Amino acid sequence: ISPKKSKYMTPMQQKLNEVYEAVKNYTDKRGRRLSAIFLRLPSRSELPDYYLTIKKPMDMEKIRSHMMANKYQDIDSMVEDFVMMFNNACTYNEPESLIYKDALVLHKVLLETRRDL
């Protein structure tokens, strides 16, 4: 159960949402939306080994709900959560894996987007 969304979006929320959407909406040459696998982690019952391999689980739905509850006090705090999520993907998965490679690309999209705001 996620925190209740706020009525209007603060300016900070709008700025954060611009970053969130840039990462969510990014597509490769073949139009594949790289974010799909990062939207929601499987549960502990579904992927138990994962949760003992990384220190702090993160997915985009967690970030989104925190963002929509007006809980992020600045851009860097959300960027940190995206970095942790991509770092976690590169920890658990092999460098030869698609998920790992997509994590490197979206990490770049993330930092470029912040840079350009």
From Swiss-Prot:
Q: Where is this cross-link: Glycyl lysine isopeptide (Lys-Gly) (interchain with G-Cter in SUMO2)?
A: K7
Protein localization: Nucleus
Tissue expr = Widely expressed.
The record gives the effect of mutating D28E as: Found in a case of clear cell renal carcinoma; somatic mutation
Q: Enumerate the spans annotated as Bromo domain.
A: 7-117
The disease tied to this protein in UniProt is: Renal cell carcinoma: Renal cell carcinoma is a heterogeneous group of sporadic or hereditary carcinoma derived from cells of the proximal renal tubular epithelium. It is subclassified into clear cell renal carcinoma (non-papillary carcinoma), papillary renal cell carcinoma, chromophobe renal cell carcinoma, collecting duct carcinoma with medullary carcinoma of the kidney, and unclassified renal cell carcinoma. Clear cell renal cell carcinoma is the most common subtype.
How this chain assembles, per its entry, is: Component of the SWI/SNF-B (PBAF) chromatin remodeling complex, at least composed of SMARCA4/BRG1, SMARCB1/BAF47/SNF5, ACTL6A/BAF53A or ACTL6B/BAF53B, SMARCE1/BAF57, SMARCD1/BAF60A, SMARCD2/BAF60B, perhaps SMARCD3/BAF60C, SMARCC1/BAF155, SMARCC2/BAF170, PBRM1/BAF180, ARID2/BAF200 and actin. Interacts with PHF10/BAF45A. Interacts with acetylated 'Lys-14' of histone H3 (H3K14ac), and may also interact with other acetylated or methylated Lys residues on histone H3.
Q: What is this protein called?
A: Protein polybromo-1
From the broadest rank down, the organism's phylogenetic lineage runs: Eukaryota, Metazoa, Chordata, Craniata, Vertebrata
Task: Report the portion of the entire protein shown.
Answer: 647 to 763 of 1689
